[PDB]
DNA sequence: GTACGCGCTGTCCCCCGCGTTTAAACCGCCAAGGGGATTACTCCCTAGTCTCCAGGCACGTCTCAGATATATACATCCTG
DNA sequence: CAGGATGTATATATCTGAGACGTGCCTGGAGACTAGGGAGTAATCCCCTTGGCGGTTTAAACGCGGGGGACAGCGCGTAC
């Protein structure tokens, strides 16, 4: 029992979406679960400070947009950041 | 005013091999993209 | 009559043997039981997981390794072909481990 | 008779052979003799300062095991963040 | 009635609900705007997606089915500009890169 | 545009090139019109070893320019 | 130091002198005040 | 002349005489003692942070603190400065 | 002579200089070069997030407190500007 | 100065300078030189030299992480 | 046996002063723009209920994954 | 300076069976649906400090040369 989260469905769900007929073992399972929970601290982390330097007490997209351009080195940036202000602006527009 | 006697003098004494890059890896700036 | 290799070509195989396999590097017994000696000292009378142990040498054999690849550039830039301890203790200061 | 057979000279329980087999893998040639304590000395310092931690853990817990997680978590705040056993 | 996921309201696949949910116990702020956790979830889906995609390749090349670590060391290792964001990570199970110095082959 | 590629063996041959061509496709057209390895070469102008990723026109070499060719022999 | 400097036994340094421009003023590191007294006596 | 800020210039000083009571200090020293403070000030609370989040408490109490002093400060300064925090509190304690 | 392009403001006796401070005796006559390479490739890498830092704040102007913490990102703190 | 002003031209133009600032950024970036030509100094003894030569810095940054 | 290690050498290429050319400093003057404080407000995110469905757990298989068995090219290291 | 013999490689066949993939079930946490009140937010104004400037003056940079010693090359013994 106790129930445990993970990301391994969402994982797979991706994974179908590229090579839709490539199978996972499982240890290589865990590592991309594991890489998931490390960038996501790594970056909200960041962005916590970044707010608490200005003073304010919410965190919104805006840092969230630096806090990225600050981690990922060059042309991911470039990228991520376009997919980002595209995949929010449509969801704002149909809640 | 530039050495290039110089440094090519110094071609001919050092004479040893160099590494250095060797793929374009554009395909990260592009494919990306369109995954 | 016999047959016998040229000096030092057994390594050439030997290297790009390793490089491709990547199971472990040493038999876990003796391993084990050296974790379990140094543990004593700080607070004896424990207990470890199986698991515990892989990791603790997978991440022992990860260090060793990269140290190594070091190491021998150091080797190379006096024009070597073999490895010295005063060539470790270069890397281990220039990294700044034992600094 | 229940516990506590505190071994000694564990540490040379790392062959030679093994140490061979390291090295290789590195991509080294030659190799000189001396190296087999040089490395005897430098993987213990290195265990030694992890172990510690790593019980330090626990014992802030107040168990009497080791988990992997404690290891993990170790390895993590000296800069030598390890992926795949749960983090 | 009738709900639906905010995911699908963004049209993806990250439980954007589970995400807000750990920024708001994670200490990380005091109050959480609403647009966060959608550019977060984004960008990790974007990420992951890269990634997988090119271990995929990476495997076939070895004619084999499945993707076993080897294949991740040997995908991360070939691209520089992920190597760089993965320094100091170590992947179990891992190997290394084949290579060997210049020097040390025989004259020809 | 036309260049001069002067050897060490004190030929110095002509190539067909654009500035936008690079160092590696020069040292392709030395392998095909002399059979000489791109891998063995070492062009030199300006008082700086050519570098193959980047193109005539980035050096800002002129027409019916000198260019120097040493054979370096990487490997073996 | 065996009159007034290992007389002067505990954690203050309140030792002294006739002339210092600090005087009944306590330290609490002997070590300076030793290295006050060689400064001083010469 | 407003917009007060704040320092620990004051008890820099302070705690200064009770060492070497006839020697003074510039400004930039006592600037960079002030960030020094900042510095270790923050990196010991943050760790505390984690240690309690993993074992998933609430508060953060004297004990934690314990602990997390014992993987920063190295090897002595570490059993000194225990035996400090350990005795300042024991006073409190009794002394409110 | 006024045509300087700033890189070159590096004289090669203040690169002298520095040496010194760190107790080399000889030196080549080709580091004259890798140095203004080198300290260039530092330098963006800094200027970059300061500025960023600035573009966050809506400010227009290079804080020292900015440059102070772009310094503790890449690992190097530096003590005595404020922070 | 006139450095600094000149790279920081790329990434936007037309920003200020706080004076002090400047300081912090030549400061910091004479630690960083200071410390590496300790290290080229190391190399360099090790081979039975005297002198250094570019590859001595180059092996250095290497083992040191930078470079690769 | 080969890689090392020691010694001999024949350089040419940095150090070391000397004139001389200069750009840095400092000193002063000046303008403004942008940063920093102050004000009125609003609308967005927190809180609280009610609910129903996505997601974790336990099974059960079949596979194709993989394993294993078998068999041929090829790259050394010798000979004339 | 080229062939022959070689142990290495390499492939191809068999099983064989643990374990990725579904598959149901069940439920607790995510979502719809409610007010509220303060964090941000425009809007404001008023220094000020940062560029920007124009003379000295002067030490620091610069170019020259010359020479001497560090080095890269080469050769030879040997012991690990
Ligand atoms: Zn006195």
């Known amino acids: 029992k106790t129930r445990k989260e993970s990301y391994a469905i969402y994982v797979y769900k991706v994974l179908k979406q590229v090579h839709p007929d490539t199978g996972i073992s499982s240890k290589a399972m865990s590592i991309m679960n594991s890489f998931v929970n490390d960038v996501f601290e790594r970056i909200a982390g960041e962005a916590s400070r970044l707010a608490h330097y200005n003073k304010r007490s919410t965190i919104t997209s805006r840092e969230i947009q630096t806090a990225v351009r600050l981690l990922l080195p060059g042309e991911l940036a470039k990228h991520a950041v376009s997919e980002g202000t595209k995949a929010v602006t449509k969801y704002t527009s149909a809640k | ?3 290039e006697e ?3 003098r110094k071609v001919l004494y050092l004479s040893l091999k160099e590494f250095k890059n060797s793929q374009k890896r554009q395909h990260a700036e592009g494919i990306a993209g369109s995954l | 009559k016999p047959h016998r290799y040229r000096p030092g070509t057994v390594a ?3 290297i790009r043997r390793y490089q491709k396999s990547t199971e472990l590097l040493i038999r876990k017994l003796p391993f084990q039981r050296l974790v379990r000696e140094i543990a004593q000292d700080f607070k004896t009378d424990l207990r470890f997981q199986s ?6 040498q997978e991440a022992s054999e990860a260090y060793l390794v990269g140290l190594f690849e070091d190491t021998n550039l150091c080797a190379i830039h006096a024009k070597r072909v073999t490895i010295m301890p005063k060539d470790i203790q270069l890397a281990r200061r220039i990294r700044g481990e034992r600094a | 008779k229940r516990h506590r057979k505190v071994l000694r000279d564990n540490i040379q329980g790392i062959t030679k052979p093994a140490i061979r087999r390291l090295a290789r893998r590195g991509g080294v040639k030659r190799i000189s003799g001396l190296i087999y304590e040089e490395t005897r000395g430098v993987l213990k ?5 992890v172990i510690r931690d790593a019980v330090t853990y626990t014992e802030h817990a107040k168990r009497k095991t080791v988990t992997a997680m404690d290891v993990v978590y170790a390895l993590k705040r000296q800069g030598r963040t390890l992926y795949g056993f749960g983090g | 009635a009738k709900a639906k996921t905010r995911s699908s ?3 993806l696949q990250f439980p954007v609900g589970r995400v807000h949910r750990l920024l708001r116990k994670g200490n990380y702020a005091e109050r959480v705007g609403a647009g966060a956790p959608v550019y977060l979830a984004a960008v990790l889906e974007y990420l992951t997606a890269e990634i997988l995609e090119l271990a995929g390749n990476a495997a076939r090349d070895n004619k084999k ?4 670590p080897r294949h991740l060391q040997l995908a991360v290792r070939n691209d520089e500009e992920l190597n760089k964001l993965l320094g100091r990570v170590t992947i179990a199970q891992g190997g290394v890169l084949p290579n060997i110095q210049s020097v040390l082959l025989p004259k020809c | 545009m ?5 050897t060490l063996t004190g030929k110095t041959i002509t190539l067909e090139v654009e500035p936008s061509d690079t160092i590696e496709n020069v040292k392709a057209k030395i392998q095909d019109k002399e059979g000489i390895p791109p891998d063995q070469q070492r062009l030199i102008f300006a008082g700086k070893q050519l570098e193959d990723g980047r193109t005539l026109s980035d050096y800002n070499i002129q027409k019916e320019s000198t260019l120097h060719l040493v054979l370096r022999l990487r490997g073996c | 130091r065996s009159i007034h400097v290992d007389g002067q036994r505990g954690g203050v340094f309140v030792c002294l002198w006739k002339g210092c421009k600090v005087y009944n003023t306590p330290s609490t590191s002997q070590s300076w005040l030793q290295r006050h007294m060689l400064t001083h006596s010469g």
């Open chain 5, 9 to 11: 309201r963004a049209g």
């Open chain 4, 45 to 49: 310092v290195f265990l030694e300062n």
């Open chain 3, 51 to 56: 698991s515990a142990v892989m990791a603790l």
């Open chain 2, 6 to 8: 110089r440094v090519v």
């Open chain 2, 1 to 3: 005013p530039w050495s």
């Open chain 5, 65 to 68: 089915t499945r993707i076993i």
């Open chain 3, 12 to 14: 050439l195989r030997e």
């Open chain 6, 2 to 6: 036309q260049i001069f590629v002067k």
